[PDB]
A paper describes a structure:
Here, using structural analyses, we provide evidence to explain why a vaccine targeting the membrane-proximal external region (MPER) of HIV-1 elicits antibodies with human bnAb-like paratopes paradoxically unable to bind HIV-1. Two rmAbs, 235 and 460, were further selected for structural studies using X-ray crystallography. The former recognizes a MPER-C helix epitope while the latter recognizes an epitope in the MPER-N helix.
The VH domains of Apo and Holo overlap with an RMSD value of 0.29 Å (Cα atoms only) or 0.48 Å (all atoms), suggesting a typical “lock and key” binding mode. Nonetheless, the V- and C-modules move relative to each other due to a range of adopted elbow angles unrelated to ligation per se. However such flexibility is insufficient to overcome a mismatch between the Fab235 vectorial binding and the MPER-approach angle required to enter the gp160 crawlspace, impacting Fab235 function.
Residue numbers in the entry:
A (entry chain L): 1 to 220
B (entry chain H): 1 to 226
Write the structure that this text describes.
């Protein structure tokens, strides 16, 4: 089997800057007969299937903009993006179609670098509908921030919570290059009704000091 | 106008089997190869095998020849991936992809890809979601901008789809990756930022679809004064 190797595994570049990423094969993909390199690149955007980008190492597929350029020969290949746009964030993977079994590189994840943006923080008390079912979920939303690293801590009557929250983060936005984050605090109805102040405390690079978004149950 | 339409999400029990379908249109099905590719969460692509729909003959990666069987039906222009004796390592997205058959050769890139089929292997049962409104706290409306949303809770397996106002509302929407709760059921939020003055006036409805349970729910989200 042919092993395909890509580097770096990830990189971040500002809009308008140049990026190059590397794909190597453990043996030559250059067929002597026709002098072609049996090498393709694909682009896979979040939520989407891979899309063919380059083939024969350097031929752009129809409709692919010319800021994408593939180069190299034999075992050493490169994908260059001459002037990155905000919508180019994706995983870029190479594939050899020289020898069965066909094999893919593990991919290079291209992330977009932008200025620091502090999150806007919102908090949602549980609905009356949910409370009827015996559980209370409290949701904290951190909207449109950069960079991705952010810390959320839950406090109930100023007691720090552990073990009863979960969170998840969106993929990077293809337009403004930010992230958003949702955290859910889960309590029983009985526990929710026994306490007053529900607070999510947010730490992020864009905040000079931590920000607390809070409500009091029944005043909300 | 070439397209490959794949079958929907599958929940299958350990040890049983599943069939993924790939229906081709917009081109002559028998004149291009169909390839199959596996992708596990956030990980690399692995090639399973290839079939010539004109002759019916498959070729397998030695890594998959015992797990996978390829067939094709000319009359319905459909290729099939059969996966057998399933395990947790088989939980993944399976793509079909088209590859040229030019100059008598199968050694080609993959020019058109299906949307993928999600297969989850698990002994747990299908369960449809409960949908709850996310109404902002008063201070979560300060300054002219507010957020509101929907909590799509206690369902199995993934995925769900969420739209707002039947698709008319897209700006400012964020639909988050589900998390698996300690009950073994998924929970997901979808939110949208809106002008604070609109909370009294505009109607906001989240449209939830969980295809594994044939559950469709539209939930109107209203502000709560509290
Ligand atoms: Cl473009
Ligand atoms: Cl589906
Ligand atoms: Cl149900
Ligand atoms: Cl009210």
């Amino acid at each position: 089997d042919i092993v395909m190797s890509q580097s770096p595994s990830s990189l971040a570049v500002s809009v308008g800057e140049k990026v190059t990423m590397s794909c190597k094969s453990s043996q030559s993909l250059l067929y002597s007969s026709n002098q072609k390199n049996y090498l393709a690149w694909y682009q896979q955007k979040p939520g989407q299937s891979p899309k063919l980008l380059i083939y024969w190492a350097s031929t752009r597929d129809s409709g692919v903009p010319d800021r994408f350029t593939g180069s190299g020969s034999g075992t050493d290949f490169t994908l260059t993006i001459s002037s990155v746009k905000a919508e180019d964030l994706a995983v870029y993977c190479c594939q050899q179609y020289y020898n069965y079994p066909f094999t893919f590189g593990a991919g290079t994840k291209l992330e977009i670098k932008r200025t620091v943006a502090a999150p806007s923080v919102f908090i949602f008390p549980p609905s009356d509908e949910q409370l009827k079912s015996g559980t209370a979920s409290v949701v904290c939303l951190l909207n449109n921030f950069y960079p991705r690293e952010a810390k959320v801590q839950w406090k109930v009557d100023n007691a720090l919570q552990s073990g009863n929250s979960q969170e998840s983060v969106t993929e990077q936005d293809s337009k403004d290059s930010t992230y958003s984050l949702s955290s859910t605090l889960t309590l029983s109805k009985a526990d929710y009704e026994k306490h007053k102040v529900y607070a999510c405390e947010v730490t992020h690079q864009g905040l000079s000091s931590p920000v607390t978004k809070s409500f009091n149950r029944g005043e909300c | 106008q070439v397209q490959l339409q794949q079958s929907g999400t599958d929940l299958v029990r350990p040890g049983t089997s599943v069939k993924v379908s790939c229906k081709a249109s917009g081109y002559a099905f028998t004149t291009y190869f169909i390839e199959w590719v596996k992708q596990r969460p956030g990980q690399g692509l692995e090639w399973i095998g290839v079939i010539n729909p004109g002759s019916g003959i498959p070729n397998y990666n030695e890594m998959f020849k015992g797990k996978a069987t390829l067939t094709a039906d000319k009359s319905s222009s459909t290729a099939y991936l059969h996966l057998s004796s399933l395990t947790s390592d088989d939980s993944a997205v399976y793509f079909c992809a088209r590859a040229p058959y030019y100059y008598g050769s199968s050694y080609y890139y993959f020019d058109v890809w299906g949307a993928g089929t999600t297969v989850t292997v698990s002994s747990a049962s299908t369960k449809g979601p409960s949908v709850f409104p996310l109404a902002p706290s008063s201070k979560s409306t300060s300054g002219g901008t507010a957020a509101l949303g929907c909590l799509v809770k206690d369902y199995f397996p993934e995925p769900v789809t969420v739209s707002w106002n039947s698709g008319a509302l897209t700006s400012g929407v964020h639909t988050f990756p589900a998390v698996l709760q300690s009950s073994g059921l998924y929970s997901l939020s979808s939110v949208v930022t809106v002008p604070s003055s609109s909370l009294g006036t505009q109607t906001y409805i989240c449209n939830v679809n969980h295809k594994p349970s044939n559950t469709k729910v539209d939930k109107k989200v209203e502000p709560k004064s509290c």
